[model samples]
Target chain A: AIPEGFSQLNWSRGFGRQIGPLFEHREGPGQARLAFRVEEHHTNGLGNCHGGMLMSFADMAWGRIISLQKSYSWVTVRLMCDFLSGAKLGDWVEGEGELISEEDMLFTVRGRIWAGERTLITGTGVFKALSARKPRPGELAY
Target chain B: AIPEGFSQLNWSRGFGRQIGPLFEHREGPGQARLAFRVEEHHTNGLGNCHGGMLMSFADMAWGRIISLQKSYSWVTVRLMCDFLSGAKLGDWVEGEGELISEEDMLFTVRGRIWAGERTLITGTGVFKALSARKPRPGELAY
Candidate 1:
């Protein structure tokens, strides 16, 4: 059952309510897009969406795009964000991710976030991929 | 004046209240530190303080650290965070920053967030410095 508070997710919002679905789909080997509506809960006192909110939104989208290939857990090793503008509360913001390249255990992804015509932030990150999981006995989910 | 809703900052309750004051003391080499108190507001339903919250805390801390430098307004060029452990809501978390080194118009600072004895996250960032006043009048803050 989808969790109660995450109904606004882009995909199956009613399915996984805790971490709402952010990605529309993984378009290709190197691309994905996701969008989120700015909400009051996402704002800082400045009346704009918080920078961390934008970062989290981008992080989740990047993780989703990479996770689709396999369930291997990945952690961020590095992230760089260039903030160009501000995003106010209630604004609809969109984030896009493109897999740049991979070298051994590390994969790089570039993400861009926008609030309408203004570019809000651009980010680049390196993710370290873990080994595929081997389920333990009695573990159903794995 | 201390902003309302800031009391939610528990770990470093007294220190958290210092953010506004610190922001005001912007002279040379300004700095700010906030203790993370694990609170339901800072955490996800998973009981762990959300990554976004931690990142936001770090960003705010960094902002103060830079604003104090007085050389130029700084913007983050790159940030790298390593999550060592997850933080439970209401857990006391602390963050501190130090100026590492500066180069041609770039200053680097390393900031860390801790949940009690456990280090929740470690971040290193490069910030580009801009002159206190732009070369041209009426230039927007980058």
Candidate 2:
């Protein structure tokens, strides 16, 4: 079942839509909660949630926190993650992020993913706002 | 056609197997090359290659550099990426990585993804060697 207070993210198109439907979340000012049920496809060779999946999830969560303004769009400049524990299949991994700071057009955010009481991943990301240049061909407007 | 000197990776199971078929690569002692033809499923709402796919590609390429030893298995501890350019559908994105440094059980690697003459993504990753714990259930031998 979907967790309380979390709703299906309205990811209508793009990578967000492709991946977001596999997970659920709740978003508020400068903070958000992302969750997904661990499935066979999510596991690594070690049978734990793949680190790449966690990083992707954290990247989206952090992007939401830093780029809340609908008028401005941002792209990831840097993303750093640490895998603390492993989330196995059948687990409901929950991810949360908060804005740590913002300077000019750069936003720094931190986040983590967990299942039950064990922390599964922790990370930080840097996002940069787009410039006045027109969006490049095939580039989505944020 | 596949790039010269590159071969299809024999990925049999796990997340690598699940995602590996979407791409191909060449590997050496401390360096590697990965590539994929951008398809509709690989694009976002704006019709560009998804960031998650790039991250996953880099993660696996970086792993090959640090986890070459058959006696030990390694896991990603951290990864940092910068998206420099966007890739459109039908573009063939190529990725390359090289080992930077190692300290005890930690390994540092750097890499970039590109299409034709344009660079798309660049990143660094840290991997940690796993200890002698028995492989968990459903865990595939790396």
Candidate 3:
């Protein structure tokens, strides 16, 4: 069953589906929140959540903060992350971030991810807002 | 068929398997190259390769550069990446990096991902080499 206060995102294709099905989100003006429950497939050789998964989640959370307009498509130009702690399987991991600044087409965002009360990753990213281009067949317009 | 001069990696489980199938590697003493052909699942909403996949590939390539010893396991502490271009489906994308320097337990690496002759992403990463810890049940050692 779906968890309370969380709804699945409409991401049924491409990398999103490859990494998510359980990906959930909550959004409001100027900010956004993303979450997923860690599973066996989300882990690494050490049995802790994989760093790449954390980084990808961070990238998505931060990017969503700036891609709020329908006329613009945002892409990550730069991303910086620090892995602070590890989230084990079955932990509910969440990410939240807000836009720090925007100068023309470039937007800067800062955010962190946590598993329960413990912070697992902290990071920042810069995204470039490109004018929306026509979507190719089989591509979802995000 | 597998690409010439590329050998399959023994990445049979966990996040690796979700993101890869026949991960191919070319290695030397201090530098290495990893490559895979881009597929529909690797793209984002814009129909280009996802930045997260590039970052994940970068993490693996850079980490492998320093985690050559069997006595230790390396995890990413920090990673910074810049997306320079995009890779389309069916493109043979590759990542290669070399060790920059090491201080105590920390190793620094820089690398780039390319499709054909076009550079898609470039980055640097810091990895912390921890002494091998006993594997937990259900975990696989890299």
Candidate 4:
């Protein structure tokens, strides 16, 4: 069964749409629990989760935190990560970020992704606040 | 015009092919000059270069180094990076990596990406070696 408070994230176009539809539980402020399932389209040359794909997930999860908590939209300024393990096809990957610090224009968050009890990725990302961007089609607040 | 020594990197299927057609100059041993142009499909919600796209580029550029230098295939164990800047649509982005250290089937690489004279990303990656993987269709040297 799906977790509580979760809804599919939707976008009309762009890389966000390309790598989605991501699901999120908008916990409101500082985090939005994010998740998805690994499928054939998400595999790498070794038939495991593509590192880029997970990075994209990590990238979005961070943005969701900013979108849910702050007044401004944001862009990734830096992303640092360690691959703890690989999530295979069909695995349900889930994660969220904690806002560890922030500046006038930056938010730094640390996060983790998992496949059940196993951790698949752990990292921190830095985001720069920008003027709120309009939501793409299917989004209510931009 | 395309620079000397560069050719398209290809795979019949999987993430490698999905992210292509990436180009590489097999400078040989410790590096491969890798590049690709940003396209509409590569944009983010704000119409800028997607961080994850460059992360993937960084990931592939590092692998190209090992593919040219080492005898075994490998998987990314860790990737750490900073987003220095963004590449706009139509920009040609290029980069490669260096072998900082290695032991017991592990290789660490330091890499950077650029769009013209501007640096786009800088990072380090750790790869764990394994028996060479059979190349997908369209590749002969697996």
Tell me, by DockQ, which candidate is best.
Answer: 3
- Runs of candidate 4 with Cα error greater than 4 angstroms are A1-5, A26-31, A135-142, B1-4, B26-31, B134-142
Candidate 1, pairs of clashing residues? A3-A17, B11-B37, B29-B68, B29-B69, B30-B68, B36-B93, B38-B89, B38-B90, B38-B91, B39-B90
Off by over 4 Å in 3: A1-3, A27-31, A69-71, A133-142, B26-31, B69-71, B133-142
Q: After superposition on all CA atoms, what RMSD does each candidate show versus the true structure?
A: 8.9, 5.7, 4.8, 3.4
* Tens digit of per-residue lDDT, candidate 1, span A1-142: 3222222443322112223334343234223556666655555544666565666676666655456555566665666677777788667677777778889978788878887799888878677777676442222323
Q: Which has the higher DockQ value, candidate number 1 or candidate number 2?
A: 2
Provide TM-scores for the models: 0.61, 0.78, 0.86, 0.86
Cα deviation of A54, candidate 3, in Å: 0.9
DockQ of 4: 0.63
lDDT of 3 by residue, A10-51 (tens): 676788777775555544332367778777777895577889
Q: Give the top-scoring candidate (lDDT).
A: 4
| Candidate 1 lDDT score relative to the true structure | 0.58
Cα lDDT tens digits, model 2, A12-62, are 555554444454443343135667776666677556778877777777766
Global fold similarity of model 1 (TM-score):
0.61
**Model 3 per-residue lDDT tens digits across residues B86-119:** 8887788888777788889888888888888899
Error of 3 at A105 (Å): 1.1
Poorest lDDT segment (10 consecutive residues) of candidate 1 chain B? B18-27
